[PDB]
Scaffold this motif. Structure first.
Motif, PDB file in Angstrom:
ATOM      1  N   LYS A   1       0.824  -1.208   0.000  1.00 49.37           N
ATOM      2  CA  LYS A   1       0.000   0.000   0.000  1.00 49.37           C
ATOM      3  C   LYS A   1       0.861   1.262   0.000  1.00 49.37           C
ATOM      4  O   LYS A   1       0.566   2.232  -0.714  1.00 49.37           O
ATOM      5  CB  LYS A   1      -0.945  -0.017   1.202  1.00 49.37           C
ATOM      6  CG  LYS A   1      -1.967  -1.142   1.142  1.00 49.37           C
ATOM      7  CD  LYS A   1      -2.848  -1.192   2.378  1.00 49.37           C
ATOM      8  CE  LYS A   1      -3.973  -2.204   2.197  1.00 49.37           C
ATOM      9  NZ  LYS A   1      -4.850  -2.306   3.396  1.00 49.37           N
TER      10      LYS A   1
ATOM     11  N   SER B   1       1.125   4.398  -2.674  1.00 49.68           N
ATOM     12  CA  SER B   1       0.989   5.807  -2.316  1.00 49.68           C
ATOM     13  C   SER B   1       2.176   6.621  -2.825  1.00 49.68           C
ATOM     14  O   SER B   1       2.011   7.759  -3.284  1.00 49.68           O
ATOM     15  CB  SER B   1       0.848   5.953  -0.802  1.00 49.68           C
ATOM     16  OG  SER B   1       2.119   5.984  -0.174  1.00 49.68           O
TER      17      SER B   1
ATOM     18  N   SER C   1       1.704   7.145  -6.570  1.00 49.16           N
ATOM     19  CA  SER C   1       0.658   8.127  -6.837  1.00 49.16           C
ATOM     20  C   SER C   1       1.143   9.542  -6.549  1.00 49.16           C
ATOM     21  O   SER C   1       0.862  10.469  -7.319  1.00 49.16           O
ATOM     22  CB  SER C   1      -0.590   7.814  -6.010  1.00 49.16           C
ATOM     23  OG  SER C   1      -1.195   6.604  -6.430  1.00 49.16           O
TER      24      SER C   1
ATOM     25  N   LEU D   1      -4.581   8.287  -2.430  1.00 46.10           N
ATOM     26  CA  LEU D   1      -3.880   8.564  -1.179  1.00 46.10           C
ATOM     27  C   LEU D   1      -4.837   8.509   0.005  1.00 46.10           C
ATOM     28  O   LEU D   1      -4.527   7.914   1.043  1.00 46.10           O
ATOM     29  CB  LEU D   1      -3.191   9.925  -1.249  1.00 46.10           C
ATOM     30  CG  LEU D   1      -1.944  10.003  -2.127  1.00 46.10           C
ATOM     31  CD1 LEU D   1      -1.436  11.435  -2.202  1.00 46.10           C
ATOM     32  CD2 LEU D   1      -0.858   9.078  -1.606  1.00 46.10           C
ATOM     33  N   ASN D   2      -6.012   9.133  -0.129  1.00 52.70           N
ATOM     34  CA  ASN D   2      -6.996   9.067   0.952  1.00 52.70           C
ATOM     35  C   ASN D   2      -7.463   7.632   1.184  1.00 52.70           C
ATOM     36  O   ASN D   2      -7.637   7.198   2.335  1.00 52.70           O
ATOM     37  CB  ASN D   2      -8.185   9.976   0.635  1.00 52.70           C
ATOM     38  CG  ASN D   2      -7.859  11.446   0.827  1.00 52.70           C
ATOM     39  OD1 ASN D   2      -7.112  11.812   1.734  1.00 52.70           O
ATOM     40  ND2 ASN D   2      -8.417  12.296  -0.028  1.00 52.70           N
TER      41      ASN D   2
ATOM     42  N   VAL E   1      -5.766   4.906   0.720  1.00 52.63           N
ATOM     43  CA  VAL E   1      -4.729   4.161   1.430  1.00 52.63           C
ATOM     44  C   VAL E   1      -4.655   4.607   2.886  1.00 52.63           C
ATOM     45  O   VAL E   1      -4.457   3.788   3.793  1.00 52.63           O
ATOM     46  CB  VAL E   1      -3.370   4.313   0.724  1.00 52.63           C
ATOM     47  CG1 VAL E   1      -2.257   3.733   1.589  1.00 52.63           C
ATOM     48  CG2 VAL E   1      -3.402   3.625  -0.630  1.00 52.63           C
ATOM     49  N   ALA E   2      -4.813   5.911   3.134  1.00 50.53           N
ATOM     50  CA  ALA E   2      -4.840   6.399   4.509  1.00 50.53           C
ATOM     51  C   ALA E   2      -5.961   5.744   5.302  1.00 50.53           C
ATOM     52  O   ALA E   2      -5.856   5.602   6.525  1.00 50.53           O
ATOM     53  CB  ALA E   2      -4.996   7.920   4.526  1.00 50.53           C
TER      54      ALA E   2
ATOM     55  N   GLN F   1      -0.403   7.005   8.169  1.00 51.20           N
ATOM     56  CA  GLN F   1      -1.727   7.465   7.765  1.00 51.20           C
ATOM     57  C   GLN F   1      -1.829   8.982   7.877  1.00 51.20           C
ATOM     58  O   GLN F   1      -2.379   9.647   6.987  1.00 51.20           O
ATOM     59  CB  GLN F   1      -2.807   6.801   8.619  1.00 51.20           C
ATOM     60  CG  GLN F   1      -2.969   5.308   8.392  1.00 51.20           C
ATOM     61  CD  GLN F   1      -3.875   4.667   9.428  1.00 51.20           C
ATOM     62  OE1 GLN F   1      -3.584   4.690  10.625  1.00 51.20           O
ATOM     63  NE2 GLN F   1      -4.985   4.102   8.974  1.00 51.20           N
TER      64      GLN F   1
ATOM     65  N   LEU G   1      -0.067  10.483   4.931  1.00 54.10           N
ATOM     66  CA  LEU G   1      -0.818  10.322   3.690  1.00 54.10           C
ATOM     67  C   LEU G   1      -1.947  11.341   3.593  1.00 54.10           C
ATOM     68  O   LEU G   1      -2.172  11.944   2.533  1.00 54.10           O
ATOM     69  CB  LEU G   1      -1.377   8.906   3.596  1.00 54.10           C
ATOM     70  CG  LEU G   1      -0.352   7.790   3.411  1.00 54.10           C
ATOM     71  CD1 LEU G   1      -0.989   6.438   3.698  1.00 54.10           C
ATOM     72  CD2 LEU G   1       0.223   7.823   2.007  1.00 54.10           C
ATOM     73  N   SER G   2      -2.678  11.538   4.692  1.00 54.64           N
ATOM     74  CA  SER G   2      -3.763  12.513   4.675  1.00 54.64           C
ATOM     75  C   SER G   2      -3.232  13.917   4.409  1.00 54.64           C
ATOM     76  O   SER G   2      -3.832  14.682   3.638  1.00 54.64           O
ATOM     77  CB  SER G   2      -4.528  12.466   5.996  1.00 54.64           C
ATOM     78  OG  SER G   2      -5.098  11.183   6.193  1.00 54.64           O
TER      79      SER G   2
ATOM     80  N   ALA H   1      -2.368  14.257   0.676  1.00 54.50           N
ATOM     81  CA  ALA H   1      -3.565  14.422  -0.144  1.00 54.50           C
ATOM     82  C   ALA H   1      -4.136  15.829  -0.008  1.00 54.50           C
ATOM     83  O   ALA H   1      -4.529  16.448  -1.006  1.00 54.50           O
ATOM     84  CB  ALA H   1      -4.613  13.376   0.243  1.00 54.50           C
TER      85      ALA H   1
END
Lengths: 32, 55, 28, 55, 31, 55
Positions: free
Chosen positions: B22, B26, B29, C15-16, C18-19, D24, D27-28, D31
């Protein structure tokens, strides 16, 4: 009134390289 | 007991490998998005520069 | 001398996603 | 010794879960930043095109 | 016709913050 | 047999630690790219607004 350009190709290439390099960090355990 | 420990090791390794997959997605991307943004930003900079030079 | 728009919504959504999905990789 | 093995496994799992939470978060944030950049770049592109059209 | 600016400083600083915080998640196993 | 379990524990720890290092590196690179994009996008926005006021 002059527009500048951005160059981040090194960072992009590094992201792709690290994506590839993480394969070497996968765990392949010894069967007991 | 050793079989239980080995099975726990396999659990941890499976979860870690899935997480790594995963995270790699990311990374790819983010690289793609940064590249597209760079392309458009530089295109529009050249377009403002052209507008100035043609005014 | 046309300005172009950028569309990286695919990358943002992934991305969201995967988060959110990393919750599934947590070890119980 | 087997208790040292099990406690090590628990330590590994806890550290892994901690790292995943931090990832996480990252990643947020990535984005969010990419979304803001997309919005502003497209806004300024439309502004430049409107300027060209108005002239 | 108004060009807007972007502010993603909090996100950038959060990325650096996580890069640093991940050191506390490294593994030191009992010998 | 428990030597194999110990070796697996060490392998898991080392692979996890190296992956975390790689991820920290990637986070630094992403932060750098985002900072540069912000700087250039706001320099080009100010340039466009200045062109507007000049006209």
């Amino acid at each position: 009134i002059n527009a500048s350009v951005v160059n981040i190709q090194k960072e992009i290439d590094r992201l792709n390289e690290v994506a590839k390099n993480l394969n070497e960090s996968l765990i392949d355990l010894q069967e007991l | 007991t050793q079989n239980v420990l080995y099975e726990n090791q396999k659990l941890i390794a499976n979860q870690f490998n899935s997480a790594i997959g995963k995270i790699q997605d990311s990374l790819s991307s983010t690289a793609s998005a940064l590249g597209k943004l760079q392309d458009v930003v530089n295109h529009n900079a050249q377009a403002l520069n052209t507008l100035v030079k043609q005014l």
